[PDB]
Structure 1
Amino acid sequence: MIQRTPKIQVYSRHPAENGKSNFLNCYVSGFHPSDIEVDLLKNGERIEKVEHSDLSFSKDWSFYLLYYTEFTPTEKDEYACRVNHVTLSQPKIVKWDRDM
Structure 2
Amino acid sequence: MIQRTPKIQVYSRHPAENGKSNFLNCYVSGFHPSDIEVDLLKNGERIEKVEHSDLSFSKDWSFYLLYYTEFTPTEKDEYACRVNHVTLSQPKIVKWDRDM
TM over 0.5: yes
- CA separation in 2, counterparts of 1:19 and 1:94? 22
Question: Among the aligned pairs, what percent are the same residue?
Answer: 100
For normalisation by structure 2, the TM-score amounts to 0.99
Q: Structure 1 stretches of 5 or more lacking a match?
A: none
Offset of residue 2 of structure 1: 1.5
Q: How many Å apart are 1:21 and its aligned residue? A: 0.8
The Cα of 1:51 is off from its aligned counterpart by 0.2
Aligned to 2:88: 88
Match in the other structure for 1:11: 11
Say which SS state the counterpart of residue 5 (structure 2) adopts: coil
TM-score between both structures, scaled by the size of structure 1: 0.99
Q: Deviations over 1:68-92 (max 9, x none)?
A: 0000110001000000000001110
Unpaired runs of 5+ residues, structure 2, are none
Q: Give the secondary structure class of the aligned counterpart of 1:66.
A: strand
Instruction: Kindly state the Cα deviation for residue 19 of structure 1 after the two structures are TM-superposed.
Output: 1.0
Cα distance per residue 1:37-65 (max 9 Å; x no partner): 00000000000020000001000000000
Structure 1 segments (4+ residues) deviating >6 Å: none
